[PDB]
Amino acid sequence: LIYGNYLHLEKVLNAQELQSETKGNKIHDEHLFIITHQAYELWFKQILWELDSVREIFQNGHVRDERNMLKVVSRMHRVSVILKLLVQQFSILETMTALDFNDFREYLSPASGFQSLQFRLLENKIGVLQNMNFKGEENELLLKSEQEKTLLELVEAWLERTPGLEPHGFNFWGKLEKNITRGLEEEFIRIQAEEKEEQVAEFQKQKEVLLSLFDEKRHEHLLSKGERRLSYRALQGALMIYFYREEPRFQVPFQLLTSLMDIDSLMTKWRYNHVCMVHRMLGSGSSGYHYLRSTVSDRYKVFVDLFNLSTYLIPRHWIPKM
Amino acid sequence: LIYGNYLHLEKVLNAQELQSETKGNKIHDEHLFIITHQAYELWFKQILWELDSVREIFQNGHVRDERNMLKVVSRMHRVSVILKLLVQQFSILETMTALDFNDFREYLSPASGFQSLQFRLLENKIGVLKGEENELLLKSEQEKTLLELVEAWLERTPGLEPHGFNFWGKLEKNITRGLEEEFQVAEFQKQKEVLLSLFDEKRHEHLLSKGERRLSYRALQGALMIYFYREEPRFQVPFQLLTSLMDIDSLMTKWRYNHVCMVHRMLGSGYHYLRSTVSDRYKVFVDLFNLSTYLIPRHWIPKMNPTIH
Amino acid sequence: IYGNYLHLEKVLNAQELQSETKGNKIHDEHLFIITHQAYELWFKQILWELDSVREIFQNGHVRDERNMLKVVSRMHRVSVILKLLVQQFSILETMTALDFNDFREYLSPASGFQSLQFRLLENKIGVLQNMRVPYNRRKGEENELLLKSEQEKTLLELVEAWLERTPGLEPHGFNFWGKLEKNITRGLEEEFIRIQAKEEQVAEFQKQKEVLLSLFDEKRHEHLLSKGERRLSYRALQGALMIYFYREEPRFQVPFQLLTSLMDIDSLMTKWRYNHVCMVHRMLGSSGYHYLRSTVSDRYKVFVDLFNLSTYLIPRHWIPKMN
Amino acid sequence: LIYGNYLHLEKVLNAQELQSETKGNKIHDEHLFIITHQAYELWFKQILWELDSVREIFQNGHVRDERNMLKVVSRMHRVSVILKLLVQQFSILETMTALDFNDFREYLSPASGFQSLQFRLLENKIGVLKGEENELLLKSEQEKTLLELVEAWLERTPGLEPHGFNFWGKLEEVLLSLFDEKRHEHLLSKGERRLSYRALQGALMIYFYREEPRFQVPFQLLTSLMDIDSLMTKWRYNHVCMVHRMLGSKYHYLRSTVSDRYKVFVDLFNLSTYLIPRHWIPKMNPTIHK
Ligand code: HEM
C-alpha cells in the first residue's frame, strides 16, 4: 500500500485547474484561491464527520450511557480546534493583493460561495434557523440536512432530561424561584437610607431581569419570534448544569455546553474574517458584502440561550443548596 | 461555472477511503489522519507553485530587472505564511490519542511519509544536501535549486568590485585596525580568530568540503554587504529576501520538529533518524544564519561615500 | 542584575486582588489583573514604535528614502504585536462567566475607558473625536499627556504629508492623474462599443462607469471629506494610487509595503475590538455591549481611504504605460 | 478603585529603564527586549498562581473530593493555553535583528536568564529532575512538587485492589518489561522514569478505562500534564532558536534542555507505548464509577 494511493493523490493533487489559464491567460495567484478553498473544503468535510457522529450518539440514545460522554466532548473539542485553524488560514489568503485578485476575478463568474454545499450542510446540521438553486443529489443531501434532527434539537432533548428538574425530587426550578424572591426582598429591605437610590434603580433593573426567567409565556413568545431557541425546560437543564457544575455528573456536561458556545463563536469568527477579506478585495439575498456583514449577528448564534444564561447569574448564596 | 466544479470538488471530496472500513472494521479517527495529510499535501503543492515561480525568475534573468524583486519577496513571504499555518495545523492531529491511532495503525502498513513525493521535491528545490514519478524527482535534483540561484545572485551584489567600493578590502583593513586599537588575553585572542577568520578563504573552502558551508566565498561577501548596508534603498528589499530565506529554514525545522513530537505521542520510543533532521544539517541557509556571528562594532563598518544612489 | 534590569521588584508587585482586600480572595481575579498588565505592557511598546515612526515622519527625514526600511519594519512589528494581542484573548476565555461574577462587584467604578495608553493609541494613529460614537452619552497630567495626543500630528496626517509629495503627480512630469482619467474614458468608450456588439451588461457597464469617473470628482471627494467618510486629501489619495498601480517600480516597493502595514494595523485593531466584545458577551450576556458593537464599524478605520482603493481597480492594460 | 490604580500601572508602566540611555545612547530596540522579558515574567507569575493552587488542592486532600476535579483540570488546561501564547510570543522578538541586538548586547552583561527566579521556581514546583530569593528557591526544591502530589493521587486509583478488581492481570514484545517491578525501580534510581511502581498502574488504569465516568476528567488531567510538558519543551526550543538567530553557533547546553530528561511527566508519555489490541484489555463487572 502506497502513501499516494492511500491518500488518493491522483484525485487531490489533480484538481487545480486555473480558469485564467484555460482562457489563455495564466494568472499566478488564481492557484492560491483554488488551494485555499480546497483546504477549507477538506476541513468542512472533517467537521461534518465529527459533527455527524456526535449527532448519532444522541439519535441512538447512546448519550444515555455516560461512558460515551468523553467521546461526544472530545469530538466537539476537535471541531473547535479545526475551526480555530480555519480562522488562522485567512492569513494565507491575505498574502493576496486586490490587484492580483482583480486580474483573475472575471474568470470566476458566475461561481459563488453560496454554491458551497458543505458549508450549508454544516450550518444546517448545527441548527442555524432557516426562515432567515442546487440540483440532483446535492439537493437531496441538503433536504436531509434540513429535515433530520439538528445538533441543537438533539442537545435540547438531552437538556430536557437533566437530573434535578423533578418537582418531587430536587425541585430545582421551584426553589430557585423561591430563593431569588427571598433574595430580592432582603435587598429591598436593606436599601433604605438618600441619593444612593442609584441602588433602588439598579435594584429595579436586577429584579426585572431575574424574575423574567420565571415567565414561560415570555419565553414562548421569544421562541416563536426566533430570538431564543431552546425550550423552557431545556433552559432549566442548562442552568442546572451551570449552577452545579462542580458536582461529578455535571462536570463533563458543563464542558459540552462550553464547547457548544466555542463552536458558535468560532463560526462567527470565521464569518467575520470572511467579511474582512471581501472588503479587502472588493470594497463596498445579497448587496453583497452587506448580506455577509449581516451574518455576523446573534441571529446566526445557534447556542444563543447558552450564552444568555450569563444574564441570569445570581449571588452564590441564592443557589439552592444541594 | 459552479463553485464545486471550479474547485474540482468531485475529486477532492471523493478521496477519503478508510482502509479500516474497506477491511471491514471502520475506525472513526482514521478519517482525520487522511484529511490532515491531504490538507498538508494541498499546501505543499502551493509551496511548490510559489517556489518554482521564484526559481524561474532567477533562472530567467528576470531578477536582473529590480522591478521583480517585490514579486520574489512577497512570494517568499507567502511560503513562510503557509509554513506557519502548516506548523499550527499539527494541533488538529494532536486531538487524536495514541490509543485511537493504534486501532487503525495496522491498516496503514507499510505506507510511509518517505513516499510523499512532494515533500521530497520541496527539500530538493530549496536546496537540502520509484515508478514514473522518478522523472519529477530526478529533475528536481539535476535542476538548479534555490540555494544555487540565490548564490549566483549573491556573487553579483554591487559593492565588492576591488576598483569600486572594494567592500572586502575595506572591511578587512577596518577589522585588523579596530583590533590592535584597544588590544583576559583569552577574551581578545578568542574574538580575534573568529573575526579575521572571516578572511581566510581556506577554512571556508575546507568547510564547504565537509558540508559545513553551502554558499561560495564571493556569495558570502555579497550577503554580508547586503547585511551591513541593508538601509541603502537598493539593499532594502534584498535584505527582506535574506530574512524570508532564513524564515523558510526555521519553519521547515519547526515542521520537522512537530512531526517528531507527533511520532513520539503516537508511537513512543524510524523515530531516531527523524530527530537528526532537526539539525543544521538540514538548514539550506546555515551560511546566512552565521552571517550574524560576524557582527562588528558599527564604527568598523566601512563608510559609504557618494556610491550609486 | 536580570531582576533589577527588568525592574521586577516593580513588575512583580503590582498584583492586588480587590476581592482579597475585601477579605474574599477570588482565585480568578488574579488572571483578570495579569491579562490587563500584559496588554498595557504591549501598549507601551506599540506606543514606542508608533511614536518613533511618527518621529521619522516629523524629523523631516522620511524623504531621505534610506530610512524607509525603519518606518516599514517597525510598522510590521506593531502588526505582529497586535496579532499576538488578538491571540491573547484566548487566555481570558478560560475564565468562566460564573467565576467572573464572583469578583466583578469589587471592580466598580473602574471601567477600561480609563486606559490612558489605549486612548493614546487610537489618537496617535488618528481616530478622531467627532468620529466617535458616544457611550450613553458622555486627568491630571494624564489629561496633559492625552491632551497633546489629539492636537499633535496623527500618523494619518503625517503619512498624508508624505503621500502629497509622491513622484509622478507633477502635471508636467509623468502626469499620472491626467493620463489616468484620459485612459479610463477611452477604455470605457471602447468597452461601451464592445457591449453594443439581455444581458443586460448595459446595467453593469453604467455602474462601472459612474464608480470609476467619480474618482476624478474633486468636489464629491471634499463633500465626503468634510462629512467624515473619507480621511485623506485629494492629493494624498492621488499619490497612494500612484504607489498601488506602480508598486513594482523600485522606488515604490517599500512604500507600497508601508501602505500594506497601515491597512494591517486597522484590520488588527478592529479584530482586537471584536474579540474584546465577544469577551463582553460571554461574561455579561445580551448596555456597554451596544456601544462596543458600534466601534467595530468602519467609522473607526483610520485608513479607510486605502481600503477603498479596491473599488477603483481598473483592467491592467488601462494603467498609463510608463516609459 | 481607578483602572490604573487597580492595575498598579504606576508600578507596571514605570519599570522600563534601558541600559542605553544610562550609558551613552538610547538604542531603540532594547525597549522590546525589556517588554518581552517583562510580559513573560507576568505570565510566569500567572502560571505559578494556577500551578500553586493545584498543588494546594492535592496537599489539602481536597482532591479526594471529586467535586474539585473540574477545578483541577480546568486550571491545568489554563496553564496550557498560557504556555501556547508564550510560544507564539517569540514571534515578536524575531522582529528584532541580530544587528540591532548587537548594538545594545554589550550593556546587558552580565544579566542572565539563569537569574530568572520564576523560571527556576516553575521548573521545581512542576518537579523537573541568590538573595533570599533563595528562601523561595529552597522551599520550591523541598516543597512537595506537582509530580509527587500527582504520584500520591495516582497511588489511590480505583480498580488496583489486590483482591478487588486486580487490574494487574493480564494476558496471555516490549510489553512484559512493564511487569519487571526490580527493572522498573532501577530506571527510577537512575531517573529515566519518575513515578513509583503503583503510581504507574493508577495511570494505566485511568488510561485503559478512560470512558468510565470517574476516570473521564482524570484522563483529562493526565492529558493536560503531558501537554504542559510538550509546551515547556517547545518553549525551550524556541528560546534556543532565538539565541542562534542572535549570537550564532558556538549555547551548546540549551540544546540539552530540549530532551526527554526534562519531561517531568515522562512516565505518562511512555504509558502510551503500552498499547495492546482492544480484545486483550481486561473486562468490567459491578462498577464503583458514578
Ligand atoms: C478573494 C477572496 C474572497 C473573496 C473576495 C470572497 C468574496 C465573497 C463574497 C463577495 C461573498 C458574498 C456572496 C456572493 O456574492 O457570492 C462570499 C460568500 C462566501 N464565501 Fe467567499 N470570498 C473569498 C474567499 C473565500 C474563501 C477562502 C472561502 C472558504 C471556503 C469562502 C467561502 C464563502 C462562502 C461559504 C460564502 C457563502 C457564505 C454565507 O452564506 O455567508 N470565500 N465570498
Ligand code: HEM
Ligand atoms: C499520525 C501521526 C503520525 C505518525 C505516528 C507519523 C509517523 C511517521 C514516522 C515514524 C515517519 C518516519 C518513518 C516512516 O515513514 O516509516 C514519518 C515520516 C513522515 N511523515 Fe509522518 N506521522 C504522522 C503524521 C504525519 C503528518 C500529518 C504528515 C504530513 C504530511 C506526515 C508526513 C511525514 C513525512 C513527509 C515523512 C517523511 C519526512 C522526512 O523525511 O523527514 N506525517 N511519519
Ligand code: HEM
Ligand atoms: C472579563 C473580561 C472583560 C470584560 C467583562 C470587559 C468589559 C468591558 C466593557 C463592558 C466595556 C465597555 C465600556 C464599559 O461599560 O466599561 C469595556 C471597555 C474596554 N475594555 Fe474591557 N472587558 C474585559 C476584558 C478586557 C481586557 C482583557 C482588556 C485589555 C486591556 C480590556 C480593555 C478595555 C478597554 C480599553 C475598553 C475601552 C474600549 C473602548 O472604549 O471601546 N477589557 N470592557
Ligand code: HEM
Ligand atoms: C535576543 C534574545 C535572547 C537571547 C540571545 C537569549 C540568550 C540566552 C542565553 C545565551 C541563555 C543561556 C546562557 C546564559 O543565560 O548566560 C539564556 C538563558 C535563558 N533565557 Fe534567554 N535570550 C533571549 C531572550 C529571552 C527571553 C524572551 C526570555 C524569557 C523570559 C529569556 C529567558 C531565559 C531563561 C529563563 C533562561 C535560562 C533557562 C534555561 O536554562 O533554559 N531569554 N538566554
Ligand SMILES: OC1(c2cc(Cl)cc3[nH]ncc23)CCCCC1
Ligand atoms: O466569484 C466569487 C467566488 C468564486 C468562487 Cl469559486 C468561490 C468563492 N468564495 N467566495 C467567493 C467566491 C468571488 C467574487 C465575488 C463573488 C463570488
Ligand SMILES: OC1(c2cc(Cl)cc3[nH]ncc23)CCCCC1
Ligand atoms: O504508516 C505510517 C504512515 C502512513 C501514512 Cl499513509 C502516512 C504517514 N505519514 N507519516 C507516517 C505515515 C504511520 C505509522 C508509522 C509508519 C508510517
Ligand SMILES: OC1(c2cc(Cl)cc3[nH]ncc23)CCCCC1
Ligand atoms: O469593571 C470593568 C472593568 C474593570 C477593569 Cl479594572 C478593567 C476592565 N477592562 N474592561 C472592563 C473592565 C469590568 C465589567 C464592566 C465594567 C468595567
Ligand SMILES: OC1(c2cc(Cl)cc3[nH]ncc23)CCCCC1
Ligand atoms: O544579558 C543576556 C541576557 C540578559 C537579560 Cl536581561 C535577559 C536574558 N535572557 N536571556 C538572556 C539574557 C543576553 C545575552 C546572553 C547572556 C544573558
Ligand SMILES: N[C@@H](Cc1c[nH]c2ccccc12)C(=O)O
Ligand atoms: N445521559 C443521561 C443523563 C443526562 C441527561 N442530561 C444530562 C445532563 C447532565 C447530566 C446528565 C444528564 C440521559 O441521556 O438521560
Ligand SMILES: N[C@@H](Cc1c[nH]c2ccccc12)C(=O)O
Ligand atoms: N539585480 C542586479 C544587481 C544585483 C545582483 N545581486 C544583487 C544583490 C542586491 C542588490 C542588487 C543585486 C543583477 O541581478 O545583476
Ligand SMILES: N[C@@H](Cc1c[nH]c2ccccc12)C(=O)O
Ligand atoms: N479521589 C479519590 C479517588 C481517586 C484517586 N485517584 C483517582 C483516580 C481516578 C479516579 C479516582 C481516583 C482519592 O484521591 O483517593
